[PDB]
């Protein structure tokens, strides 16, 4: 997939990974555990919603 | 839903998020009066749903 | 002036935040007063 000079992703997954030389690792992140009925509210800040 | 509590019913004594529908009673202390001006003091109690 | 809502935005150019004033007491009945349905003390 192609990106632009500002882009953000994730990427999750069993995988391993090396930081290519135009790539920055910001963040790492872990998926959230939620029982049925049970959760959180989550903001898209692109969209604002 | 803030509500009357006490034992001589005082408004915004209790504060609640659900309506008890259900059959229960509460209970009043009244002052009355006769045709003959004597001051009587009664022990009410009223059920309801 | 206009108000712009609902989404995300970036204030193009030539732009700038307006601030809107209240009347006297106004803000006390918006926020520390709000519901009075709730409360009648
Ligand atoms: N969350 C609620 N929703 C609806 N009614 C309620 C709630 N909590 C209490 N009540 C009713 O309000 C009344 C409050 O009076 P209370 O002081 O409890 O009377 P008593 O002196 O008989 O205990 C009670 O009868 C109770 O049934």
Excluded at chain 1, 25 to 41: C, K, T
Aim: include cysteine; hydrophobic fraction near 40%.
């Amino acid at each position: 997939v192609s990106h632009q000079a500002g882009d953000h992703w994730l990427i999750r997954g069993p995988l391993e990974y090396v930081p290519s030389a135009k790539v920055e690792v910001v963040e790492e992140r872990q998926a959230i555990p939620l029982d049925e009925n049970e959760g959180i509210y989550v903001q898209d800040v692109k969209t604002g919603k | 839903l803030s509500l009357s509590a006490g034992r001589p019913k005082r408004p915004h004594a209790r504060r609640a998020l659900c309506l008890l529908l259900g059959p229960d009673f509460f209970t009043d202390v009244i002052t009355i009066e006769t045709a003959d001006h004597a001051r009587l003091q009664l022990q009410l109690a009223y059920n309801w749903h | 002036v206009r108000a712009v809502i609902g989404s995300t935005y970036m204030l193009t150019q030539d732009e700038v935040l307006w601030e809107k004033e209240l009347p006297p007491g106004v803000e006390e009945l918006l926020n520390k007063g709000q519901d009075p349905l709730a409360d009648r003390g």
